[PDB]
Write a protein that binds this ligand. Structure first.
Ligand SMILES: [Cu+]
Ligand SMILES: [Cu+]
Ligand SMILES: [Zn+2]
Ligand SMILES: [Zn+2]
Lengths: 153, 153
């Protein structure tokens, strides 16, 4: 199964995120190329619950969290399903990379097809700050771009 | 279950299409409001197979057709699942309306979540012209706007 999200917004940030998963038990490979970010930075990257673009990136809602856990890093046990951590941008502000994840799925009751990917304007603190807010969003800040995850071939 | 697609493009046409279906057996209610079209016209309106926006409305692919039938009107027995016919635009070029459909589903193996809605620049001939092309696209022409169907609440 393959899926893709095209990230768009009004702030100069844009990109493509591709997902591939062969079967339900297998990890999903996530690959991305995002440009227009601050150079040499770490930026929060997550799957949000809704694929609703009627009000910019706001209507994407909270981090996708079917299991009602707190925000964490992708390697934490306690993490939202949608937590993909920070992506690193190079000196031209481009973030490009790929990783495998075993909580994100394109198949089955937790499928992220039809939901949204959001790239943030700030660094995700990976649920390690103080605030209650660190345990909800990682204090990653505004959402300059986002896209609905759709099926492809 | 509710879903929404925001139709966008570079041609002045834009809109929102909402879908609601309570359970798998129930009809899905489709409601839309699309502006920027030719005034007093009929325009082809369909669900296309892929929710891929990497190349405008082109990468949405063909009409969603899991059962391998020919193109038809929404009331025809032989019709693609994605065939929603023509929408009528008023004197200000706005198409606004709603209908129920029993082939389009948001639940189950034929779910349209993660696929695309496309509004065409021409009238759909409802598979009644001559050509082979009438039995494939309804000769509805270019795709000025489209959007991926995403989940909402
Ligand atoms: Cu986020
Ligand atoms: Cu079409
Ligand atoms: Zn989170
Ligand atoms: Zn068709």
């Amino acid at each position: 199964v393959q899926a893709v999200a095209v990230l768009k917004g009004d702030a100069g940030v844009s990109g493509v995120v591709k997902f591939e998963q062969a079967s339900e038990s297998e990890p999903t490979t996530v690959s991305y190329e995002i440009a227009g970010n601050s150079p040499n930075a770490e930026r929060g990257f997550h799957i949000h619950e809704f694929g609703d673009a009627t009000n910019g990136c706001v209507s994407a809602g909270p981090h996708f969290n079917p299991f009602k856990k707190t925000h964490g890093a992708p390697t934490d046990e306690v993490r939202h399903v949608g937590d993909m951590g920070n992506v690193k941008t190079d000196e031209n502000g481009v973030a490009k990379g790929s990783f495998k994840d075993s909580l994100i799925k394109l198949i089955g009751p937790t499928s992220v097809v039809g939901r949204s990917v959001v790239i943030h304007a700030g660094q995700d603190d990976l649920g390690k700050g103080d605030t209650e807010e660190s345990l909800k969003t990682g204090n990653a800040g505004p959402r300059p771009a986002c896209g609905v995850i759709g099926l492809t071939n």
